[PDB]
């Protein structure tokens, strides 16, 4: 950088990825992979074919690939992650409104830390923390050992509400409890007609 900084640009972190994909041309990669497949006698054919599926998937439908980097994240409505006071005044709260809290904290500190111009050794660690917090918010455990918070149990992420046995894609198809219904033991009625 000191010797030659005017003729090259480098970066690190997700900002580098965003800058890399900003001016990335989708058509060139698709054509290169297609040509490699056409020259199939090379063993690279398999890897090129594997890549071409995703590359064409992004090449089609018009939608840009920059959606993989987030400049903003949504917040689920409160009542889907409610805070409820049980009988006796004890409060119960979902895990989500804690995960979001972390993302709100580390973000704000970053927005503070940048303002005073702290050294890169601190700002980059803050950025790493922010990205890790977001990753834990979306899919806790995809990084490695998941966050636990209180007790020694993992906190449920957003994905965990759609992934496991409990969720709106597994538990929803198992039916619902209904009103205007009852249950009772049976005895034999021999005098009854079939209907």
């Amino acid at each position: 950088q000191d010797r030659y900084g005017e003729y090259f640009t480098g970066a690190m972190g997700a900002e580098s990825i965003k800058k890399l994909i900003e001016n990335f041309d989708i058509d060139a990669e698709a054509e290169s992979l297609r040509e490699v497949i056409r020259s199939g006698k090379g063993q690279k054919k398999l890897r090129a074919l594997k890549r071409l599926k995703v590359v064409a998937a992004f090449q089609q439908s018009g939608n840009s690939p920059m959606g993989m980097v987030l400049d903003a994240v949504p917040v689920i409505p409160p009542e889907l992650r409610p805070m409820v006071q049980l009988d006796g005044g004890r409060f119960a709260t979902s895990d989500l409104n804690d995960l979001y809290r972390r993302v709100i904290n580390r973000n704000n500190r970053l927005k503070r830390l940048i303002d005073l111009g702290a050294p890169e050794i601190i700002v980059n660690n803050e950025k790493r923390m922010l990205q890790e917090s977001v990753d834990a918010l979306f899919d806790n455990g995809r990084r490695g050992r998941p966050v636990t918070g209180p007790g020694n149990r993992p906190l449920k992420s957003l994905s965990d509400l759609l992934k496991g046995k409990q969720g709106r894609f597994r538990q929803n198809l198992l039916g619902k409890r209904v009103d205007y219904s009852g249950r009772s033991v049976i005895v034999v009625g021999p005098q009854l007609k079939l209907h």
Partner: protein, 104 residues
């Protein structure tokens, strides 16, 4: 087995648009150029600045200059250095440091 409640309560009233509260809409513009609308009651007293959806404290379009909303200035690193060093001492510090770089 155990029961609880949300932070609020429900209301059973029924009426619909047949009752109209007189309202008018104010217009705001933010720093980045986005524009927004806010319906207020005809009691008005509309504020000069409003926190819009995007999070920028936008300003009203009707007035040429909004409420000044003046605030005290921030405290910075020099301003706190000046609370412990006199300008006379800083002059001597500058002279002392200029002596070394001048040596070469």
């Amino acid at each position: 087995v155990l029961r609880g409640s949300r932070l609020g309560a429900v209301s059973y009233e029924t009426d619909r648009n047949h009752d109209l509260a007189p309202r008018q809409v104010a217009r705001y513009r933010t720093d980045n150029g986005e524009e927004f609308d806010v319906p207020f009651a005809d009691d008005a007293e509309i504020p000069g600045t409003w926190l819009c959806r995007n999070g920028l404290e936008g300003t009203l379009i009707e007035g040429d200059v909004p409420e000044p909303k003046k605030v005290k200035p921030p405290r910075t690193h020099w301003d706190m250095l000046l609370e412990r060093r006199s300008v006379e001492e800083l002059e001597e510090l500058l002279k002392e440091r200029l002596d070394l770089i001048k040596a070469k």
